[PDB]
Each structure stands twice: as C-alpha cells, then as structure tokens.
Design a protein around this ligand. Sequence first.
Ligand SMILES: O=c1ccn([C@@H]2O[C@H](COP(=O)(O)O)[C@@H](O)[C@H]2O)c(=O)[nH]1
Ligand SMILES: O=c1ccn([C@@H]2O[C@H](COP(=O)(O)O)[C@@H](O)[C@H]2O)c(=O)[nH]1
Ligand SMILES: [Fe+3]
Ligand SMILES: [Fe+3]
Ligand SMILES: [Fe+3]
Ligand SMILES: [Fe+3]
Lengths: 193, 193
Amino acid sequence: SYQDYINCSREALLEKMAELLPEKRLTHCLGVERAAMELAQRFGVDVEKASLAGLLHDYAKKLSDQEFLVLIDRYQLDPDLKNWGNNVWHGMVGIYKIQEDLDLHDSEILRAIEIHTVGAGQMTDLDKVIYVADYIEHNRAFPGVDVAREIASLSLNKAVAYETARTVEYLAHQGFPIYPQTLETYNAFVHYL
Amino acid sequence: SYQDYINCSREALLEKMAELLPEKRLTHCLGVERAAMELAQRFGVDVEKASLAGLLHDYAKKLSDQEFLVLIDRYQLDPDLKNWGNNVWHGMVGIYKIQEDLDLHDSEILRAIEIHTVGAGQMTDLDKVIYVADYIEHNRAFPGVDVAREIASLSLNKAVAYETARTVEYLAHQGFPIYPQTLETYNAFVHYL
Ligand SMILES: O=c1ccn([C@@H]2O[C@H](COP(=O)(O)O)[C@@H](O)[C@H]2O)c(=O)[nH]1
Ligand SMILES: O=c1ccn([C@@H]2O[C@H](COP(=O)(O)O)[C@@H](O)[C@H]2O)c(=O)[nH]1
Ligand SMILES: [Fe+3]
Ligand SMILES: [Fe+3]
Ligand SMILES: [Fe+3]
Ligand SMILES: [Fe+3]
C-alpha cells in the first residue's frame, strides 16, 4: 500500500493534493500514476513504487520561489540552484517538501521524482519510467505524443531519448535556458534514437 | 600585413589552403574573411586580426581523425576530446595544426579559431566576430540566414545568441550529440534574444 512509503492512505494523499494543486495538475498526476504503472509492468519495475512516484512527481509544482529558496538553504543544496526557477526546482528541490509533508524516505522514489524534469546521465529503470510516464500520460495531447507513446510501447531508453531530444529542441526554439543536467541526459541517451 | 602573424603572405596562404581544402570550403573561408572584416569594423575589433582569423578558421577542416587524435596526445589536451569528432576538433584541436604550419602565436586569433564552432560562456569581441561571420558569410543561403544578417547588422551579442539557439535546436532536431561547451555558450547568451 502507499502507507508503506508515506504517512497517509492514497485517499488522504489525493485530498492533500487537491488542496495543493489546480484540477488540471491533479488530473495530470493521476494520469502519470496510471501511465507509470503500465510502463513499470512492461519494463520490470516495481509497479507500486512507479504508481506512487508518478502520482507524487508534480506534488511541489505550486510551491513559491521563496519556499524553494528556503529549502535550498535549509538542506544546503547546490547554490547554483538559486540561478534557476520552478521548472528545475519542483523536482530537484520539491523532493524535500514531499519528504517533509509525507515522511517519504524511499531513495529510489525520491530520486525518480528528483530528476523527472531534467533526467541524468545515469537513470534507474524507475527514473526512466517516471520521466517517460510524465510525457505520455493519457491527458496530454501535444503534437507528436502519439510517436512518444509508440516508442514507449517498445523501448524505455528510446522513449527517454525521444523526450529529451524534443525538450532540448523546444527550449532552444523558444530561447529558454537549458539546465546543464538536461544536456547530460540528452548526450547519454541520444544514441538510442 | 598577414606576415605580421603567420610565416607567409596572404597569397602564399591561399595557395597552401587551396591544397588543403575543396573549393567550396576555400570560397567559404574567403567569405568569412570578408564578413569578419565588415563585422570587426562595425563593432570595434581589429579588422586585420578578424580578417585573418576568418580566413583561417576552417583551415584544419579536412584533417583526419588520426591526426587530431595525434594532436590531442602531443599537446596533452582534454582526454574527453577523443569521445567527439571533426565538428569539435577542427577548431578546438585544429588550432595546433595552424600553429605548426603557419607559426601563428597570437593568442586572440588562436582563441577565436579555437571556439568558432562551440563558442564559450565568455567570448572576446573578436571571438564573437568570427563565430558570427562564419554563419552570415555571403556564400551561405540556409533558411533564416537573412534574419542572422539583420541581427548581426545591429548586435554582435544577439547574433551570437541567435546562431547558438539555432544550432542547439537543429542538433536536437537531428538527434546529434551536443558538445557541453556549446550549451555554456547558449545559456550565457540566450538572454540577448
Ligand atoms: O532543462 C529543462 C527541462 C525542462 N524544462 C521545462 O520545464 C517544464 C517542466 O518539465 P516537466 O517537469 O513537465 O517535465 C517543461 O515544460 C520543460 O519545457 C526546462 O525549463 N529546463
Ligand atoms: O556543439 C556543436 C556545435 C556545432 N556542431 C556542428 O558542427 C558543425 C561545424 O560547425 P561550424 O564550425 O561550421 O560552426 C556545424 O554544422 C554544427 O551543426 C556540433 O556538432 N556540435
Ligand atoms: Fe514536473
Ligand atoms: Fe508532470
Ligand atoms: Fe568550422
Ligand atoms: Fe566555417
């Protein structure tokens, strides 16, 4: 059960999350919970760790800059992190908030949440499941999501590569800064294409 | 004169380069020589250093992997460099070949050639002139070159930003690895957009 990892039932979690998140963001999280379960089953990952990580991955989405900045100091994280924003922080720093609120201590789940936005050059199968599930969950409809879904039906590594390539391309297209760990992920996975 | 920097006249250089390079690549280099002069004049860079760096920037374009690998060892460069290829090497390693053949010792010219493909987070005005001149030289016709030309007519920094953004976008589009120093350049310059 979820209580094996956090300090409340799935039902009570959803109630807590309904406070913290707009509906669309909660619906998304429920989408990722389902998508992560299906991927985990296909690629030999613990379906329960995947489901929970997937539901939790955007938990800290709506924390404010101030809190993140507080969390960076409190936990004495990489000081470079202050140079970035919500996109980077919600996973990379947001894990500390999850840990505070829900008493989550499982290292594999925490890591999968941590790098769900930017990945890493080395990713566990659980990390990849969350990273991909986030992208392909049934509520998303961005052009090319169908291709991501097909790829993910066949290869977890190739789905990581495709998603990462598309994010880097889109961020450069938009003129947005790109977190250097994202490029670590890109270069590590791009051969899979 | 060019002989103030290298060990032969411009004429004798062009003869040497005509041996080393296909016509199209030499025509390109002549294009960059002209474009660098015009940019240098507009943005207060030594027109002669710019012209020479521009003519020389793709000198080592057609060295083979073997030679580059030789040069990496000989000059005890970053060992990580062996993991890459011609795109990265021709400027970053190719400067050592230029130095061998032409007795080029000027640090500013050497640096501008060194990073002409990937840039750096910190670039001198001369570095930027070569980086941009390479992209906008009159022989190039890629779609959007007109926009690069307009931008470069107004702002060197913004032209660096535009070029870098487009390269990162294109490489991700193509599924090609991206040299991490390229992202250093991207993140350093992207605000200028
Ligand atoms: O290095 C990165 C990677 C992703 N994003 C952006 O941050 C958002 C949050 O990503 P995700 O957590 O929805 O995957 C995405 O929309 C993506 O465009 C960045 O700003 N930098
Ligand atoms: O980090 C980079 C930057 C550029 N290139 C590619 O290498 C080529 C050489 O660049 P340039 O020296 O013509 O600018 C370009 O066509 C570009 O697509 C890379 O492979 N990696
Ligand atoms: Fe997220
Ligand atoms: Fe998400
Ligand atoms: Fe070049
Ligand atoms: Fe060139």
